[PDB]
Design a binder for these strands. Structure first.
Ligand SMILES: [Mg+2]
Ligand SMILES: [Mg+2]
Ligand SMILES: [Mg+2]
Lengths: 58, 95, 189
RNA sequence: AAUUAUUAAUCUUGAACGAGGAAUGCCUAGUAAGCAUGAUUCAUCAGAUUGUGCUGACUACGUCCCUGCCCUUUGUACACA
């Protein structure tokens, strides 16, 4: 319901069997590794519906 | 044509060696031929690990480890990729 | 003193989301008198975000084979829809459309991820460009399906769909499809 | 030379079809799709090829999951493989 805004500070790589998944590192000011669908850039802004969650390594 | 000098196992100056049973598939294998692995694992992953930390009394808690010591047969071991297939020269490389 | 369709200003419109501010264009180069510009917007990856928002609306409005390339008919449809929108709930129709764009795309989704051979349907996050594109696509599809074998005209259907999308009412196509996407996303992770 | 009706013109007659099951094809920019046209055959006949222009999108800027092709190591009792 209530979004949380996080800033993308770099892009790490692509996962998925067909490579349709993007790994980022986002910052509120804590850091998280999150996992995105769709074209992204460093500088973009995400609307996180969950706060306590990370992505496994790639 | 004798592809291995030691015949696939490390036995010398002995007649018989007692067998053990594969941790995955139950087959009997002599103890000197099975591949051994020793594991020191955690009970949970790191996020649950920290979640237990502030749910705990004593203010200084450390989770215990697990000690396993598993053993496998050739077929059941190289299907899981603990061991792979190498070239003629690379086979001789121990360690 | 440049107006859309020579009637509406968008000199005072705001976004108020701050995630979608960079991805929708009502500013210096994108202030136009008519939504026809024959630009080259697909040559690079992110240049799609500088096409004026109403021209992207009209670009999705000509679909299902029967209507491919018929740009002017789409522009006429959109212009009369904006007149109908202004007549009822009298506001700037472009502001209403921007509000509806901001609401019609899901914020999170699901996909198959191959963590360690065994897989799931894990929840993922949606980027701002993806959200804008999905909002446009779902609004256009809702209006197009409403008007097929119906007494009501296409522009009446489009005006109704945009107004309902801006008000979060669960009688629009986009809002309900988006809610279903988000429910499944919350269920699979 | 027109019957088994060459093609064209006028009035009359007015069928199935309401978006297509299991499957499966082509395609990344003036491109897909939609729209018509010149030539080839040609006494007469294009719902076909081969060119030309007109109106003009959506989606990606990737991957090795399916299919195909290639290279390295490995096994072979195959060599018409
Ligand atoms: Mg013996
Ligand atoms: Mg022929
Ligand atoms: Mg493959």
């Amino acid at each position: 319901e209530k979004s949380k805004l996080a800033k993308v500070e770099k892009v790490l790589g692509r996962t998925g069997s067909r490579g349709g998944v993007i790994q980022v590192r986002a910052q509120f000011g804590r850091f998280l590794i999150r996992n995105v669908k769709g074209p992204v850039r460093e500088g973009d802004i995400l609307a996180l519906l969950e706060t306590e969650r990370e992505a496994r390594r790639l | 044509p004798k592809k291995r000098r030691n015949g696939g196992r490390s036995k010398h100056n002995r007649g018989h060696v007692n067998p053990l049973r594969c941790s995955n598939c139950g087959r009997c294998v002599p103890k000197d031929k099975a591949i051994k692995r020793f594991n020191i694992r955690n009970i949970v992953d790191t996020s649950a690990q920290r979640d237990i930390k502030e749910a705990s009394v004593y203010s200084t808690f450390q989770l215990p480890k697990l000690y396993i010591k598993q053993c496998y047969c050739v077929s059941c071991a190289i299907h899981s990729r603990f061991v792979r297939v190498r070239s003629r020269e690379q086979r001789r490389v121990r360690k | 003193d440049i107006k859309l369709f020579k009637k509406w200003s968008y000199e005072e419109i705001n976004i108020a989301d701050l995630s979608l501010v960079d991805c929708i264009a009502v500013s210096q180069k994108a202030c136009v008198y008519t939504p026809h510009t024959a630009g080259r917007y697909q040559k690079k990856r992110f240049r799609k975000a500088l096409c004026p928002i109403v021209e992207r609306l009209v670009n999705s409005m000509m679909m299902h084979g029967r209507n491919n390339g018929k740009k002017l008919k789409a522009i006429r449809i959109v212009a009369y829809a904006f007149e109908i929108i202004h007549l009822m709930t009298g506001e700037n129709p472009l502001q209403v459309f921007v509000n509806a764009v901001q609401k019609g795309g899901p914020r999170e989704d699901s996909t198959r991820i191959g963590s360690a051979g065994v897989v799931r349907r894990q929840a993922v996050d949606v980027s701002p460009l993806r959200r804008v594109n999905q909002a446009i696509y779902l609004i256009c599809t809702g209006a197009r399906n409403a008007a097929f074998r119906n007494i009501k005209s296409i522009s009446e259907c489009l005006a109704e769909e945009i107004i309902n999308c801006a008000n979060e009412s669960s009688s629009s196509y986009a809002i309900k499809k988006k809610d279903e996407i988000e429910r499944v996303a919350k269920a699979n992770r």
